[PDB]
């Protein structure tokens with residue numbers, strides 16, 4: 001529940017299903033340490049990545065594997081993957097939803113940060 | 117349930133709350149006939165606009181009153197309102213969600229069309 | 233050039249060429265009067281719609297005929313057209329660039345406004 | 349000019365000026381080698397990063413330093429930077445324009461690719 005990813009397909013107007021998502025956390029030596037991963041569900045969502053206890057303050061990267069999604073559809077894409085890099089902050093609202101809207105040569109990403 | 121609107125604020129990373137939304141349907145003389153309206157909830161969503169029986173095939177317009185949302189925040193905006201104009205089709209998936217992502221000088225809108 | 237429209241295609245990563253654009257201006261009786269129209273060039277841009285002298289203060293609507301663009305590429309898109317509605321020149325003359333980035337089931341519209 | 353970066357500010361409706369941009373290229377050992385860097389001009393554009401000769405096939409990463417841009421405007425944004433990762437020149441030389449549209453809690457990134 002503190003980190004959710006939602007991915008939509010702007011070409012088909014649908015959730016983007018079965019997209020691989022890898023989360024990393026930035027280590028003290030500046031490398032990216034694997035943190036969590038999964039595939040989006042039938043509703044384009046990936047829940048259950050981490051817990052409140054482990055999602056401590058720090059810098060995280062969410063990679064969304066957009067190229068493999070488009071290739072499966074036979075559509076030749078621009079980006080290798082979409083990247084979302086941010087600092088997790090204890091002060092603000094407690095839930096972070098990372099949304100991504102995908103097109104072959106463009107994507108947007110937005111963070112919705114809310115309280116239950 | 118066949119038509120839902122969801123609105124997000126890209127400046128604050130939050131749902132856009134208390135945004136007025138007016139839906140129109142295009143009449144046989146080409147004018148826009150009021151159809152439904154409401155304000156987005158605390159989660160940025162507006163449900164309950166119409167029913168399956170009345171949401172027949174035709175051209176609809178969804179106006180989102182973005183200027184009043186930004187003015188309330190003290191932020192001077194570009195657009196008078198965001199407009200979403202589309203044909204409702206019985207053939208495709210049965211639920212239409214119109215999403216809008218708002219910034220003072222830009223917005224995106226996406227249609228997610230799915231089956232329950 | 234006080235008003236310029238630029239349209240890009242997010243499926244192909246290219247300018248959206250030969251897209252029809254209609255501009256209207258709200259009259260004192262509340263109707264939308266035809267103001268100017270044209271088609272985007274090879275660069276996806278439409279210049280020459282108006283002059284400083286004719287582009288007076290007002291509420292303008294830029295209608296970008298996105299459905300016909302997609303149909304001619306074999307795509308059946310969600311929206312009929314993208315509309316951009318804004319007050320212009322209400323604090324003196326400005327230059328406006330209205331951009332639209334198109335995908336079949338999504339678009340974004342942006343304005344860059346500069347003071348000559 | 350085979351690689352050009354353009355950055356716009358969706359809060360102000362303006363070019364995003366003096367944004368730092370770092371370009372990297374993936375080496376055969378998988379590390380990201382520094383390739384070129386610069387800052388956007390008054391127009392929000394960064395030209396002159398590379399030459400046809402140096403811009404060979406490869407996987408490139410364009411890192412746009414959006415956090416520092418917002419902080420200097422008094423805004424505490426969500427993302428550390430926007431990353432754009434793509435394979436270039438894998439079917440011969442192309443021209444690439446990488447655009448980013450920024451808001452505090454959202455960005456979109458787009459590419460227009462043309463064949464000289």
Ligand SMILES: O=C(O)CON=C1c2cc(Cl)ccc2-c2ccc(Cl)cc21
Pocket residue numbers: 106238240329330331333340342343344354356445446447448449456457458459460
């Ligand atoms: O939405 C993006 O990712 C940036 O796209 N917007 C673009 C863009 C994108 C590209 Cl690749 C080239 C030019 C523009 C442009 C020019 C004027 C204006 Cl007002 C907007 C834009």
